[PDB]
Amino acid sequence: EYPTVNEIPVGEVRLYQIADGVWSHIATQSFDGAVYPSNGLIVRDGDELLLIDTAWGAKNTAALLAEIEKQIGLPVTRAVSTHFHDDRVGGVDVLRAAGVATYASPSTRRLAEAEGNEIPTHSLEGLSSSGDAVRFGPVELFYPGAAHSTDNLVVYVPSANVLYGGCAVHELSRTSAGNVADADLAEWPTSVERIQKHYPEAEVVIPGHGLPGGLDLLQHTANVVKAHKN
C-alpha cells in the first residue's frame, strides 16, 4: 500500500506514515522520457516538522506543504536537502516563500549554485569528511563519502531507526544504477558500506526512489553498483 508511480498524477503528493511521527512523501516527475516517483521524509520536531528533501519542483513542493497542512497540521520550519540535484533542491524557493528555513551542506550549496539549481539558504557545518555525523533536531545527518553524487547525505531517525538513504540507496526492484552523471561509481559501494556499519540498528530503509524496505537495500544497492561497473 506504499504509493507507486502509477497512482500519483504529476503535481500531486502522497504522504505515507512510516512510524510514529515519521512520514515519507512521494511525488512524481518527468525525467528522461519517463515518469519517476521520488521520496522524501517529514519528521516530527516536537513542536514542528523537519522536512528532508523537496518534492522535486515548485508545483510538487507546493503540493507537498499543502498535503502536510491538511494531514498533520504542524508547521514545517526547516528543510534539509541531501544533494544538489533538482529532485532534492527543486522547490527551495517555494519553501522559503512558505517561511521554511532551508539547509544543505556547503558542499551541496556550491554544487547546486554551479548548476543553477535552487540554493538552500543555510549551511550545515560538520559533514565535510566521510563518516561524519551531526544531529539536526530529531534526525542524524551522516555523510558516507561519495556515492550517487559527491555530496549525498543520508538521514537517520534514531527514535524510529528509520534510515533514509536519499539517492544513494536503490529500491530492491531497481536493476540499474540511476543517472550516473555525477556518481562516484568506484567509491559508491564503499560509501554504502560506511552506512551499513554506522546504522546496523536500522529497521526501515527508504530509497531515493521507490519502495522502502530493510537493510537489504544497501546490499542490493552495492550489487547493483558493482554490476554496472563492468
- Catalytic amino acids? 83, 85, 87, 148, 179
- Does the protein bind Zn ion through residue 174 (CB under 5 A)? no
Smaller CB separation from Zn ion, 85 or 220: 85
Residues 162/202, Cβ–Cβ less than 8 Å: yes
Residue 85 binds to Zn ion (criterion: CB under 5 A): yes
Please name the residues in contact with 174: beta carbons below 8 A apart, sequence gap of 6 or more. Answer: 207, 209, 210, 224
Minimum distance, C-beta of residue 170 to Zn ion, in the bound complex (Å): 12
Is 198 annotated to bind a ligand? Reply is: no
Our finding on whether 78 is near Zn ion (CB under 5 A) is no
Cβ nearer to Zn ion, comparing 14 with 85: 85
Question: Which of these segments, 1-9, 53-61, 83-91, 189-197, binds Zn ion (CB under 5 A)?
Answer: 83-91
H or E element in which residue 188 lies: helix 188-198
The residue range among 37-45, 77-85, 155-163, 213-221 that interacts with Zn ion, by the rule CB under 5 A, is: 77-85
For Zn ion, which is the closer residue by CB, 20 or 32? Answer: 32
- The separation between the first and the last C-alpha atoms of the chain, rounded to the nearest angstrom, is 36
Assess 220 for contact with Zn ion (CB under 5 A): no
Interaction of residue 167 with Zn ion, rule CB under 5 A: yes
* Percentages (nearest 5) of helix, strand, coil residues in the chain: 25, 30, 45
**Cα of 168 vs its chain's centroid, Å:** 9
Which 184-213 positions form the footprint of Zn ion (CB under 5 A)?
none
Task: Return the C-alpha cell found at 114.
Answer: 554551479
162 in contact with Zn ion (CB under 5 A)? no
- SS3 assignment, position 151: coil
DSSP 213: B
Residue numbering of the annotated binding site: 83, 85, 87, 148
